[PDB]
């Protein structure tokens, strides 16, 4: 066994052009993972109360009370973009392909090493590292997706985005049915409102165990492990954005009058009256045909409540939103059309040579235009009779419920069987790749965290743990804690993710928005004198596509 | 009107009637319940 | 034309170009000047057929 190598390293990005403009991309990420000995070799069930932030009668979105069960098992997640591509590869995909098809995924673990630490209390004292060539690693695969699903991208507990940089798996944990009640309360609401943690519904008690529910493999140095190839089932991902609203749909009016010279103030006037114009409207009252009035085939995107913090049996939780943009540049509602927010550190972006412990982030703002400016709407009478009068129109400015800050915009939900929509684009690096799908008879149209949802089948979770190394004293008839030999193990992980895409042709005359290196970018993509690396976020869908 | 729109059978004591077999078209019914909200979804925090 | 024995005419072709704007509502009473402008065009959404 122990001489000899088990695998090879490959972090190469291969592009193989086929026929009829189809490429077959295969990203390989062979990272070297390090892992320490689990503190407890026992399963825990911990409750989290933070009933000291949820008392301030102002703080309700700060409810950090949940219930988790800790597993001695350390997980490994690679469901990220930053872990596959590098800023130089992404440019290729994004500037030249028009659609992406996620294909294969196969993981491989090799060159397992397990070393014991001997603490020679002598002066310093000093530490002596050795190899326990008979030691083991406990690799497991939930190939039959039996356990919950914990995408470790959400909380930037992924894998390093820099290959030449050794990374660390995430200690596994999952949810346990916790029951609670919590009523809102502003700074003024008198008395003590209501908030408690009864416990658990005996019905919804699922206590998982990896040892019990999955085949475990012990690998020694001489061993190796390989998942085989898993094929996904997923609709393709588009690398284009829609810039069309409801005012950029169909046959525009015919301009009876056109400018006769230049000037950004020479407007071509139609030359007809609003209450004598031909066409179709979705009104039976008026005779006014406007760009706002005219009947459009449908409605792009929707309009939903903002900051509609709902709640159920587990506690309050915000209402998701599938939005694009919806306003002039730096003229948006960051929360109305739901703009993601990403917080990582050192190992998933951010300047490697940083200090302190404060995450960095970005509020990714797509290019698609389905979003809204809830600050330019209104609900008026069926009488129309404009110029509309106060008592005949409910505007954004006009409070609802007597309180100021509130709107009808805030409480508004315009989602009709006529709502047109576009899924959430990739957010690279950081962002997630693929995400399991809800087991509900009825399922969400699209997920907010990932472009690819695998329905019928997804690749299983890779749980990586260290095997208990025992001393000459051990009484299973003693609580204590199986005092064990301070063991840790270092192993190399490799990945092959396969994507198949198509190439973009030009159809316009005006060049399309591409990705480049400015005098402002340069040093965002290169190490520095000390070796300070970092990966910035960059818009994915940057290329027009006609909606209709 | 039933008389107008459907074939009627007269059965006397000696008679009998039988519908034949009808096959339905329906998605299966699950005998399980979901206890997960929005607070019981994903990777919980890491308790330091 | 909906009458066959009646000679008709095609329609001069035209299509939309990305125009960016802002306009806030305002009743007959809403005081001051509300807000409404045409910045122009988002260089991203420029399709010239």
UniProtKB/Swiss-Prot annotation, chain C:
Q: Where in the cell is it found?
A: Virion; Host nucleus
Protein's job: Capsid protein self-assembles to form an icosahedral capsid with a T=1 symmetry, about 22 nm in diameter, and consisting of 60 copies of two size variants of the capsid proteins, VP1 and VP2, which differ by the presence of an N-terminal extension in the minor protein VP1. The capsid encapsulates the genomic ssDNA. Capsid proteins are responsible for the attachment to host cell receptors. This attachment induces virion internalization predominantly through clathrin-dependent endocytosis.
Q: Anything further noted?
A: The capsids of autonomous parvoviruses expose a proportion of VP2 N-terminus and part of that sequence can be cleaved of to form VP3.
Family, according to the entry, reads as follows: Belongs to the parvoviridae capsid protein family.
Q: What is known of its domains?
A: The N-terminus of VP1 is sequestered within the mature capsid. It contains a phospholipase A2-like region and nuclear localization signals that might be exposed by capsid modifications during virus entry.
Q: How does it assemble?
A: Interacts with host TFRC.
* Name this polypeptide is given: Capsid protein VP1
Q: Which organism is it from?
A: Feline panleukopenia virus (strain 193) (FPV)
Q: Which residues of the full protein are shown?
A: 339 to 387 of 727
């Amino acid at each position: 066994g122990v001489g000899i190598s088990t695998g090879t390293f490959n972090n190469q990005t291969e592009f193989k052009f086929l026929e009829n403009g189809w490429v077959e991309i295969t990203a390989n990420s062979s990272r070297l993972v390090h892992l320490n000995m689990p503190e407890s070799e026992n399963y825990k069930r911990v409750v989290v109360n933070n009933m000291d932030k949820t008392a301030v009668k102002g703080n309700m979105a700060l409810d950090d009370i949940h219930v988790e069960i800790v597993t001695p098992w350390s997980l490994v997640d690679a469901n990220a973009w930053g872990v596959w591509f590098n800023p130089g590869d992404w440019q290729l995909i994004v500037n030249t392909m028009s659609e992406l098809h996620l294909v294969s995924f196969e993981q491989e673990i090799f060159n397992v090493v397990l070393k014991t630490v001997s603490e020679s209390a002598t002066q310093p004292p000093t530490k002596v590292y050795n190899n326990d060539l008979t030691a083991s690693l406990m690799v497991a695969l939930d190939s039959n997706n039996t356990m919950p699903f914990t995408p470790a991208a959400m909380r930037s507990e992924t894998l390093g985005f820099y290959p030449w940089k050794p990374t660390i798996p995430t200690p596994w944990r999952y949810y346990f049915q916790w029951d609670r009640t919590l009523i809102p309360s502003h700074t003024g609401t008198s008395g003590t409102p209501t908030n408690v943690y009864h416990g658990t519904d005996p019905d919804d008690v699922q206590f998982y165990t990896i040892e019990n529910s999955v085949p475990v493999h012990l690998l020694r140095t001489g061993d190796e492990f390989a998942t085989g190839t898993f094929f996904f089932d997923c609709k393709p991902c588009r690398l284009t954005h829609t810039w069309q609203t409801n005012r950029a749909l169909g046959l525009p009016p015919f301009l009876n009058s056109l400018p006769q010279s230049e000037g950004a103030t020479n407007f071509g006037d139609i030359g007809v009256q609003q209450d004598k114009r031909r066409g179709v409207t979705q009104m039976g009252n008026t005779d006014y045909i406007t760009e706002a009035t005219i009947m459009r085939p449908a409605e792009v995107g929707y309009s939903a409540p903002y900051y509609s913090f709902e709640a159920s049996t587990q506690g309050p939780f915000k209402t998701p939103i599938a939005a694009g943009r919806g306003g002039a540049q730096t003229d948006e509602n960051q929360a109305a059309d739901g703009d993601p927010r990403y917080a990582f550190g050192r190992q998933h972006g951010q300047k490697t040579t940083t200090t302190g412990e404060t995450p960095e982030r970005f509020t990714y703002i797509a290019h698609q235009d389905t979003g809204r400016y809830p600050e330019g709407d209104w609900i008026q009478n069926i009488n129309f009779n404009l110029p509309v009068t106060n008592d005949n129109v409910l505007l954004p400015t006009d409070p609802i419920g007597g309180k100021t800050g509130i709107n009808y915009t805030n409480i508004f939900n315009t989602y009709g069987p006529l709502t047109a929509l576009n899924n959430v684009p990739p957010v690279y690096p950081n962002g997630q790749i693929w995400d399991k799908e809800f087991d509900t008879d009825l399922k969400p149209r699209l997920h907010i965290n990932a472009p690819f949802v695998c329905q019928n089948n997804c690749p299983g979770q890779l749980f990586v743990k260290v095997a208990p190394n025992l001393t000459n004293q051990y009484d299973p008839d003693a609580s204590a804690n199986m005092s064990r030999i301070v063991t840790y193990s270092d192993f190399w992980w490799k990945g092959k993710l396969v994507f198949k895409a198509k190439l973009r042709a030009s159809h316009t005359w005006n060049p399309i928005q591409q990705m480049s290196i400015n005098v402002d970018n340069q040093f965002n993509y290169v190490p520095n004198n000390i070796g300070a690396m970092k990966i910035v976020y960059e818009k994915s869908q940057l290329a027009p596509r006609k909606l209709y």
